[PDB]
């Protein structure tokens, strides 16, 4: 069945899933730049772009 | 934090105090310009009349 899955394989699958969840997130957070807020919504904070 | 609440079934609409009191659209208020700027459209609509 295409709509179905075998339960005894659940853990195996979930595990591998988490493994990719990690692999796919292995990056360094890069810094971009800002601009001061020209409105009064915030007290002149620096919003990242 | 000047959240406004609409009047239901005849009751008058009300805006929130600085003290945390909901008052009706009448009397003498004190608004720092900013407030209007942040909510130009909404305030214009609710208060004008």
């Amino acid at each position: 069945s295409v709509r179905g899955a075998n339960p005894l394989m659940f853990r195996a699958n979930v595990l591998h899933m988490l493994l990719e969840f990690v692999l796919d997130n292995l990056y360094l957070n890069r810094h971009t730049g800002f601009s001061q807020d020209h409105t009064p919504f915030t007290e002149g904070a620096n919003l990242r772009s | 934090d000047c959240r406004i609440s609409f009047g239901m079934n005849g009751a008058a609409p009300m805006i929130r105090d600085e003290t945390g009191m909901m008052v009706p659209f009448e009397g003498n208020w004190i608004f720092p310009l900013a407030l209007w700027q942040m909510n130009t459209r909404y305030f214009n609509q609710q208060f004008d009349a």
Partner: protein
Amino acid sequence: LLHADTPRLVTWDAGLCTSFKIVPIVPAQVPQDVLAYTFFTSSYAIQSP
């Protein structure tokens, strides 16, 4: 032995550091027979978080 593919270690992300997103399942009840549309922020094209 002479030359093994070298792994790609350094990678950068300029976007948001999140893996969860909030999604709409059932649309809002607007317009409706009780709350006048002039109440909802969405009616003023206000962008929400």
